[PDB]
Design a protein around this ligand. Structure first.
Ligand SMILES: Cc1cc2c(cc1C)N(C[C@H](O)[C@H](O)[C@H](O)COP(=O)(O)OP(=O)(O)OC[C@H]1O[C@@H](n3cnc4c(N)ncnc43)[C@H](O)[C@@H]1O)c1[nH]c(=O)[nH]c(=O)c1N2
Ligand SMILES: Cc1cc2c(cc1C)N(C[C@H](O)[C@H](O)[C@H](O)COP(=O)(O)OP(=O)(O)OC[C@H]1O[C@@H](n3cnc4c(N)ncnc43)[C@H](O)[C@@H]1O)c1[nH]c(=O)[nH]c(=O)c1N2
Ligand SMILES: Cc1cc2c(cc1C)N(C[C@H](O)[C@H](O)[C@H](O)COP(=O)(O)OP(=O)(O)OC[C@H]1O[C@@H](n3cnc4c(N)ncnc43)[C@H](O)[C@@H]1O)c1[nH]c(=O)[nH]c(=O)c1N2
Ligand SMILES: Cc1cc2c(cc1C)N(C[C@H](O)[C@H](O)[C@H](O)COP(=O)(O)OP(=O)(O)OC[C@H]1O[C@@H](n3cnc4c(N)ncnc43)[C@H](O)[C@@H]1O)c1[nH]c(=O)[nH]c(=O)c1N2
Ligand SMILES: NCCC[C@H](N)C(=O)O
Ligand SMILES: NCCC[C@H](N)C(=O)O
Ligand SMILES: NCCC[C@H](N)C(=O)O
Lengths: 442, 433, 440, 441
């Protein structure tokens, strides 16, 4: 994809360059390849200084939780140059991965696969750009009708505010860390999204006997609890969960069909109540769950401590189920905080050097980013309403049919449990290219 | 165990000789064995003509869903002669089972294990006897024994036995949808292997057979039908969108540990009810993952041959409910808050109710304390009796129907070895000291 | 690929259209595709349509090789002839993803190869059984051989036809191997003819036939296991010389001998090291069974032990360390009498004996008999170079003419030679060696 | 079992208190329990200061490679108190092990079970006792036939020599470390049997970037190669194997029937040629093989290194196949040795240690029995045990009330299960009937 001058009127601007935007960029490339099919002025803005995929949780040994066939191209076109298999071949690694007999690459490897993808679009991506607002624009003096948008971004290095004009906008900014409201702010209280990048700076000495607590019972909580035991081999770690136990993620094959690309149509057209009941019944596919293999390795590690000492209170690493944090003392010059625990049903204290908080994410950042254009929604809406093709509803007497804003990655409530994942990314990128660029390339 | 003359006043009579009563019999044997602990008058009444474990569902290839370590003795005393490993050694099969490298024996094999246990108690078990009522007795207004009346299934004659203590261990009764009519071609899962072959005699005919439900039994029946009638057209009808996997992940699975019954029983009703609901995936409306996948590959091969799933020989109809049954004509609607199948048979795999003891005890429920509409079992499974109406040497115990008070392990094999031990100490404890 | 008129001088004629030749046609197609980067080519195939070992497409049989080792992906994952691309064209890619397996059903993997093969219909002549490769000399003044005449028998009409080509590839797989001393009888059927021939012999699926199976490898286990479902009342007997079925090896360090990049290193080794290396890796391919199938068969036997502790009474039995000493097959009797002795006093009466004893890969020697005098003086076997071209006497054969062997070269090229393992990459090298300079 | 006074004439003296002898003592207990069936003078001598099972190879995370049902009692009688399942019950862990859902306990745990068994026989076991010779004895001067043996043991603490008299002797001494001949003696060259016990004493600082080499391709080499990478996370380890690859151990179910106890009869009665051919064809069940799960993990580790750098030669931890050591230079002050390698059809490594995982020889019984070697029948140069493991003696030189039995060193005559735990439970039973059968009847 060729770059467009920054001051020119773009056909599309995407906010964020994570996998969701990357799959749009790939799909456009493939849609423009005569070899694969029957140029738009595009750019991408990403706040990070270079492409990176959840680097705070690139835990040593952590694995993907989705078949590599669900990559950024293969489900739309296995012939694409951006398949995961073509990447291995380009690296001289395909025969070697074949002998792994796994559908589950290491997270480190799949991120390098996406880095290999992203770097081929570097001419159309501006890194170190934090988008802060979308502002309406009207190109014609005669009309009060909005027919473009001005996107404003702050450069993370200079702080300078730059402005770009585009006819259409995509918001693909993933999630922001979700914290329990009652925890106080403190350098020693670190969300899972920043585990690998900040906790080593906080606890520099790998051999010191730190007390480190982990809050949560889902995949990130189990991976952090397990990694800590290897990363700090002399530590005393504690897993604090509201649930009675870690529970297994569900990717049994019939259940897993809710993630098929062709289900988005059927999910979207069902009623709101039916959608919420469906999301709840399938909660075990994605939320507050741990891969069984990790459950079993952690259970075996607990069992070995039981062999060595039958008294669980003396174990080096413990799990405290059905617990909730009632108070955290974080004042004073001392190394450690005092966490107060009660049962999580409708006394005990831990002194810890750090509390890792694995409570997931919110996906509501588009509301702050779009506030200066929310007066363009149809009358009476307090939320953005994406259509099946992901374009939000605008008042048609206020917005031209040539302008629009699309949302990506935050539509689980309307489009299904695959919306925030990689599951439908290859196909969605294709649908998006037809939606945003169809008539232009036709 | 030696027999007691039928006309004598027993120390204990157990109603039903399924695994729960068998473990009680085994625990008593071990309690009386000097090798294991350095005789009470007992007897068992069983409706079936001989020992059998869910004979309607011994489908070919069906496996146990619980480790063989959870047999009728091992968790209580690994040295017992009634362990599953001791049974295999007695059969000359222990080295061969070792090499299977499985904790989950065939259900056919596990039934044989318990049959082998049961035959060692043949002298105290009366088979072909349907208990029909438990009546109070007064040896005064204080009740100090119970008269248990049973109908012989062969003669129909009503026999009567007197006992100081009674155990009700009668498992469950088939739970049916209220809207199904009575017809020989509508069969609960409990009678699948024993009744459907007599109905569908010719294995090669193109029968249409429907299977109702989405749990382990529905999947086993659905899958077995395709092998048993290879030209049939089968349909699995589920209210749910998919079969879901059973959970025995190791931390979740500790709720079935024997020492958790103490903590579970002492929790409040609300905590017990919420605990049961969150752990529902361990036992209800769930299928062993291996079977889900096996069935999925079978669907996949049909997809290879025909991309149109509506033309497939064997189908799954998710999110459906039966609205009427009129070959029978099944009418289906969506199960969310006009389809028809014509079927030669309807298999109904909807589980069980365990409330059959209430009718069996109806004539003694006036001995409960004032204001009770249900039997209230204590931790040791003894039901509360009015202390001014029933002597303390008399009482009634419930087994297998106490999930609400004692946890999800109550109707399963999980805690039987240990529970038998508690039951023998509960019921015969002071007698043996 | 466009067809070449039959009477014209071809650049390449391949004998056989199985997977080995199929990887060649796909490779040449891709070499000519501008997205990824015409010779006069034709393929002759004895079968009337494309088919891959149809006698052993037993129900539930699975591949023993990763779908990644299909006919294109290791050479170019972008090719249109990949297995993942096949699934996508059939609208089945998402459903296969949820299978979570690298091992498709053999029935499915054959449909993928048929789907590929159908795109070359214009350059494949089916129903043509090649019978000889004859020398040709274009110049009456020269004694030099510079083209070859391939004669093929029409399987329907019996008519013989001749096609001329400068270069020949022999890609004809293997021939059924039978133990000498078994006699010929319609009730004695090699594994290669199981699905196509046994139903014609034993028509009644419910009759209590006695059926014996000879061998201890993958096909023997699959036939033994399939018979029990196909004839549910039968008595089956698996007769093995070995003491037990042994598991096939695709553990990851060992499995690298099948890497495409091992063909160079293996080939450059001496005969002794090559003969020794093949021997040490026998468990990857010969007289071995998929562990999962071993475990299933074992579970079936254990259940019979639950039902009856006397092994002699079992419906289905395995007889280890046995050899067949004699077969009585004349007489009006439906059944044969197989006489057994230990292989270090048994008779079986059987309605059929299935023989799962593998293949020989020497059939090209008869097909090349009329050109073997072009070999260098003193050779008794065709000597394939690294690029699979056989050594010819350079004073007898022009440098523009040659013959290549495919699939029969394990002795020089390693255990992957007769499998699907290196076909994608080998198809590509073959196109470079045969057509490289032409496409310059 | 009740102890017998040291100076008295014993019925049985066992050299060694490892698993083979432990199953015999357990079997004798169970034979004497009226609870299990319808006391002989016994004592056990063990060189180690207390019971231990290959503690040099109790690698963290190491698993058993045999189902727990093949413990020290269960195949002979599941009702014994010495079963693995009963041990868990005594330790209050049975339900917790059940939820593990594995037939393969940790090596750490299974050793603890045998320690739990062994401690119940502490009264008949003399630890720290190295038996050095067995000496013929004649109770009647005028008769020329031997009817007892004197077993002499050296105390590892004091050096004091102790002699004990017995009518029957069992030799159950496991193996001695087998080293390749061309390797020299050096403290930085340590056999695998001494890994956990010696290597940390050599390489004290776990964080320095040591070069450590491992020689071999079987289970022990892979276990040590994998463990070094976690134990010394900054080290560079090298696995050197003569074979081209690590190969999976075979315990598939039909092949695995060779370890069934009832097969010992059929195997023993085969001719030497058939037995030698049988051992070779089933070699992948026990020799130069690694548990598949470990192979796959080591392979995943190599693959991740390939992800980080495609050039193998720059990798931290490497595997060098089809290699042989042609020379080791180890003289001088330089901390590292120089290993010289050639293909096994000029490469050199500087190493701080060479771990040698080359298995064992089981011929130590010949030196120990040298002073009784003249009692064998004429023309034998090796001890030949009968099916019941009793060695052949000249019947004119030794009374029938006396004899010597071998345990664990009889693979050649009794099958691949002989050196393992596979038949210990049943064999212990046969041994008590052979040695004490008439005595208890
Ligand atoms: C540790 C961990 C592990 C997994 C997963 C999450 C996490 C945290 N996921 C789910 C995950 O959401 C998914 O893998 C993708 O990251 C979805 O990509 P998105 O593009 O929607 O956003 P994502 O968070 O990937 O990327 C969003 C981008 O937007 C940028 N951005 C934010 N604000 C901006 C602004 N104001 N201006 C410009 N740019 C901005 C961010 O920097 C980021 O680069 C997953 N899914 C799956 O299918 N399989 C799996 O195995 C996993 N595993
Ligand atoms: C098909 C199937 C498969 C499984 C299971 C159930 C079913 C239906 N279960 C759970 C099952 O309930 C449990 O294994 C035991 O059978 C419970 O034993 P009870 O004897 O308490 O009931 P159960 O039904 O076993 O026994 C009750 C007995 O009383 C008799 N009876 C009833 N009424 C009577 C009367 N009025 N008079 C005299 N006798 C009477 C009955 O005939 C029966 O023999 C299971 N659990 C587990 O832990 N692991 C597993 O894998 C499975 N698998
Ligand atoms: C039951 C079974 C199962 C498997 C396998 C074989 C068998 C029999 N194979 C091994 C097999 O060799 C391989 O898969 C490929 O078929 C190799 O194909 P070839 O083209 O080399 O010849 P192959 O035998 O496939 O086909 C050669 C073709 O040549 C044609 N032909 C022969 N002689 C002729 C003549 N005289 N005139 C004209 N045409 C002629 C034949 O008709 C045939 O179609 C396998 N491999 C693998 O990599 N993974 C696996 O899981 C398996 N599984
Ligand atoms: C690291 C490792 C791991 C395993 C195994 C071996 C090794 C090295 N084995 C095989 C192993 O040989 C077997 O488990 C038992 O050790 C066999 O016991 P032995 O009694 O033959 O003695 P073993 O070799 O156990 O012990 C012999 C004893 O004799 C003593 N002794 C020696 N000489 C003496 C003397 N001169 N005087 C006094 N005492 C003396 C020694 O001190 C020692 O205690 C195994 N098997 C299996 O079935 N499953 C498995 O998973 C494994 N795993
Ligand atoms: N959390 C990851 C879920 C991935 C999903 N099961 C899929 O197969 O697409
Ligand atoms: N017969 C199967 C050979 C496949 C080979 N192990 C491979 O991985 O290429
Ligand atoms: N090397 C350990 C051998 C274990 C053996 N396969 C058995 O089943 O006894």
């Amino acid at each position: 994809l060729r770059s467009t001058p920054q001051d020119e009127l773009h056909d599309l601007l995407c906010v964020g360059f994570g996998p969701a935007s990357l799959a749009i960029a790939i799909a456009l490339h493939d849609a423009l390849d005569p070899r694969l099919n029957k140029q738009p002025k595009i750019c991408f803005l990403e706040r990070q200084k270079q492409f990176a995929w959840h680097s705070g949780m690139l835990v040593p040994g952590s694995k993907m939780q989705i078949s590599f066939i669900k990559d950024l191209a293969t489900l739309r076109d296995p012939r694409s140059s951006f398949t995961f298999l073509n990447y291995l071949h380009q690296k001289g690694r395909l025969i070697h991965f074949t002998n792994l007999s796994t559908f589950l690459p290491a997270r480190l490897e799949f991120e390098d696969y996406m880095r290999w993808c992203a770097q081929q679009f570097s001419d159309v991506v501006a890194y170190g750009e934090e988008v802060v607002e979308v502002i309406p624009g009207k190109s014609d003096p005669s009309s009060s009708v909005v027919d473009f948008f001005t996107v404003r971004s702050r450069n993370v290095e200079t702080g300078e505010i730059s402005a770009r004009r585009t006819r259409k906008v995509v918001i693909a900014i993933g999630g922001t860390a979700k914290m329990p409201s009652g925890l106080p702010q403190d350098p020693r209280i670190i969300h899972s999204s920043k585990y690998c990048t900040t906790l080593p700076a906080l606890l520099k000495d790998k051999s010191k006997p730190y007390n480190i607590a982990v809050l949560g019972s889902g995949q990130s909580a189990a991976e952090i609890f397990h990694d800590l035991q290897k990363r700090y081999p002399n530590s005393r770690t504690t897993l604090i969960m509201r649930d009675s136990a870690m529970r297994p993620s569900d990717d049994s094959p019939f259940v897993n069909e809710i993630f098929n690309p062709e289900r988005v149509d059927k999910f979207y057209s069902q009623s709101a109540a039916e959608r919420q009941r469906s999301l709840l019944a399938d909660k075990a596919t994605n939320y507050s769950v741990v891969r069984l293999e990790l459950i079993e390795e952690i259970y075996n590690d607990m069992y070995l401590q039981r062999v060595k000492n039958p008294d669980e209170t003396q174990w080096q690493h413990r799990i405290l189920p059905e617990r909730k944090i009632t108070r955290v003392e974080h004042h004073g010059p001392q190394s450690r905080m005092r966490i107060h625990l009660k049962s999580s049903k409708p006394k005990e204290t831990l002194e810890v050097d750090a509390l890792m908080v694995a409570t997931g994410y919110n996906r509501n950042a588009h509301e702050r980013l779009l506030s200066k254009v929310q007066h363009l929604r149809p009358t009476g809406q307090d939320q953005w309403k994406p259509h099946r093709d992901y374009r939000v509803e605008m008042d048609p007497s206020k917005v031209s049919s040539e302008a629009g804003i699309w949302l990506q990655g935050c539509n689980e409530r309307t489009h299904g449990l695959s919306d925030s994942l990689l599951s439908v990314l290859a196909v969605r990128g294709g649908e998006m290219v037809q939606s945003i660029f169809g008539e232009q390339l036709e």
